[PDB]
Curated annotation (Swiss-Prot):
Function recorded in the entry: Sigma factors are initiation factors that promote the attachment of RNA polymerase to specific initiation sites and are then released. This sigma factor is the primary sigma factor during exponential growth. Its activity is stimulated by RbpA.
Coiled coil regions in record: none
Region described as Binds RNA polymerase-binding protein RbpA: spans on this chain: 1-87
Top-level division of the source organism's lineage: Bacteria
Family: Belongs to the sigma-70 factor family.
Protein name: RNA polymerase principal sigma factor HrdB
Lineage: Bacteria, Bacillati, Actinomycetota, Actinomycetes, Kitasatosporales
Shown residues in whole-protein numbering: 213 to 299 of 511
Organism name: Streptomyces coelicolor (strain ATCC BAA-471 / A3(2) / M145)
Record text on subunit structure and interactions: Homotrimer (Potential). interacts transiently with the RNA polymerase core complex. Interacts with RNA polymerase-binding protein RbpA via its sigma-2 region (residues 211-347) in a free form.
Amino acid sequence: DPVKDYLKQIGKVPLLNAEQEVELAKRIEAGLFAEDKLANSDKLAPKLKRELEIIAEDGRRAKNHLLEANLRLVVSLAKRYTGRGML
DNA sequence: GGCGACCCGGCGCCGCCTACGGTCAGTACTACGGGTAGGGGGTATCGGGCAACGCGGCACTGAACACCGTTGTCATGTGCCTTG
């Protein structure tokens, strides 16, 4: 029962291709640099800090895009490795 | 619109003790890295075997006194003989 609901929760999400995934990774590194700059104790402009924060949030969104995409692969591997004592 | 069915869920039960019962289940890997409980030797502290040194009864060096016992001792008193 619950696994059916989790597979439903996976539902339909956009699968990832080479161009989409590499663009997402580019946004990820952009956001990582943005939060790096934010974490620096040096004073930064307020609007600049908000720009860095929003790109970091967009990178987080990209992260969840990758994870929600590859839930299907990880459950495939789980099927490969299940039935040996753990749930 | 509340009844009504019906439909389903949902549970809940189905009686009391007694002898023994036979077994087995599939698809990573290396690699490092720390860090240890175990292997060692050497040292400080506590835990055993022979004498220790008390006591006590009495016992003796008997010594030195004490307790009767004794024959020492004797200046001093009766009895006979000689003279007033």
